[PDB]
Structure 1
Amino acid sequence: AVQKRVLKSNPSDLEKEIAQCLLDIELSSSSDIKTDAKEIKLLSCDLIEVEKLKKKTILIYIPYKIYTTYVRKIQRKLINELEKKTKKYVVLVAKRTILKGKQKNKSFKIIPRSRTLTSVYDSILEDIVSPSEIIGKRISMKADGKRVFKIMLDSKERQRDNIEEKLISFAAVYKKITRRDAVFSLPP
């Protein structure tokens, strides 16, 4: 039924809930984003819980090609619709291969810039904020030798009441994905 259609692999409970929700959104149709999710196929879904315990956040992995072509174009409205349907905080990300060019893999000449560790990690930072847009990045090196990514967003999100819970969620999600701490801010 819904789960096999949305998720290619054998599906867990929250993967099946996402599949059900996504099918229900497509079937019901959200008027401005009509043809809502027909092209979508999912790789995986993951559940992450903030230390502050302001609900839960869901990370969803999507193929780069599907993500770029479909998801990116409607993403803020799409995530808001997914959030409205299931109240846990959703993030949509592209899976991206990261390549060590030392090994000389058959399918690539040289080193692609898109597959560099740094480019992918910056791209994943872009994916998590994606409905909102970065004004500037600044990396603070604290005295412990930890490095902290201070990410400035734009001033349009002062309308959104979910702001702080999403900022903590972005920090948590990035921290789970790789061992980089973020902090967030926006103009006064």
Structure 2
Amino acid sequence: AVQKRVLKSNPSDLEKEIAQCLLDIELSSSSDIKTDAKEIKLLSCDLIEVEKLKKKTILIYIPYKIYTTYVRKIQRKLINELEKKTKKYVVLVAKRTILKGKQKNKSFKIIPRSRTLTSVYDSILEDIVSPSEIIGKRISMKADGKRVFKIMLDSKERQRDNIEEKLISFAAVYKKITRRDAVFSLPP
């Protein structure tokens, strides 16, 4: 039934807890979850704990097609309901193929731009911020050659109370995904 329906990965408790929360929204029939949670499929989940230690954050991988068609459409409303159920800070991202064309893979006349490492990381950066929208990107090159990605977000979600912990969370998630340093900001 429900665990097998939701979870792509083999049976696991915390993944099952997210599935349970989505099911809890689906059973109850909350007002603004449009056409239910019910076609959401969980690929896998990871748990990340930030240095500043304000709760813990869950990253959720979703199959690309489900994520674009279902998750992206409703995403702010869906995340807030899931956040309300969930005891920890959740972010949903699309799983994406990464490969190099010098390996000369079987089904490819040239690797698509969508499957390029840089494009994938930019696309994932879009996915994590998603309820808020990127104004601009800037890469600061430290004297010792360390590189810091300064990401400016919108002015709409600036006036939320949860901002800096969320910015820390975005920075944390992107670092866990790829070991670049981030900084995030909101307009003066």
- Band of TM-score, shorter chain: over 0.9
Distance in 2 of aligned mates of 1:80 and 1:109 = 42
Percentage of identical aligned residues: 100
Query: Does the Cα contact within 8 Å between 1:134 and 1:153 map onto a contact in 2?
Result: yes
In the superposition, the TM-score normalised over structure 2's length comes to: 0.96
- CA–CA distance in structure 1, aligned partners of residues 168 and 155 of structure 2: 17
Query: Which deviations, in whole Å up to 9, do the C-alpha atoms of 1:156-177 show, x marking residues without a partner?
Result: 1123111111110111111111
Cα deviation, residue 26, structure 1: 1.1
- Deviation of 1:87 after TM superposition, in Å, equals 2.8
Q: Quick check: 2:34–2:74 contact (8 Å CA) kept in 1?
A: no
What CA deviation, in whole Å up to 9, does each residue of 1:6-52 have, x standing for no partner?
A: 10221222101001001111111221223222111111011111111
Q: Equivalents in 1 of 2:125, 2:59: separation in Å?
A: 13
2:150 corresponding residue in structure 1: 150
Structure 1 runs not aligned, ≥5 long: none
2: distance between equivalents of 1:126 and 1:34? 23
Where 2:10 maps in the other structure, the secondary structure is coil
Query: Are the counterparts in 2 of residues 29 and 36 from structure 1 also a CA contact under 8 Å?
Result: yes
Structure 2 residue aligned with 1:91: 91
How far apart, CA to CA, are the structure 2 residues paired with 1:34 and 1:71?
Answer: 11
Q: What is the rounded CA distance, in whole Å, between the counterparts of 2:138 and 2:63 in structure 1?
A: 29
Give me the CA root mean square deviation. Answer: 1.1
| Contact 1:22–1:37, Cα closer than 8 Å, also in 2 | yes
CA contact (8 A) 1:49 1:55 kept: yes
Please give the alpha-carbon distance, in whole angstroms, between the structure 2 residues aligned to 1:63 and 1:32.
23
**Under a length normalisation based on structure 1, what TM-score does the superposition of the two structures give?**
0.96
In 2, the alpha carbon distance for the partners of 1:4 and 1:166 equals 32
1:45 and 1:61 in contact (8 A); partners too: yes
CA distance in 2, matches of 1:34, 1:121: 29
Structure 1, residues 101-140: CA drift from partner, whole Å, max 9, x if none?
1112112211200000100011111111011100000000
Alignment length, in residue pairs?
Answer: 188
SS state of the match for residue 32, structure 1? coil
The runs of at least 4 aligned residues of structure 1 exceeding 3 Å deviation read none
Equivalent position of 2:177 in the other structure: 177
Q: Distance in 1 between matches of 2:11 and 2:112?
A: 33
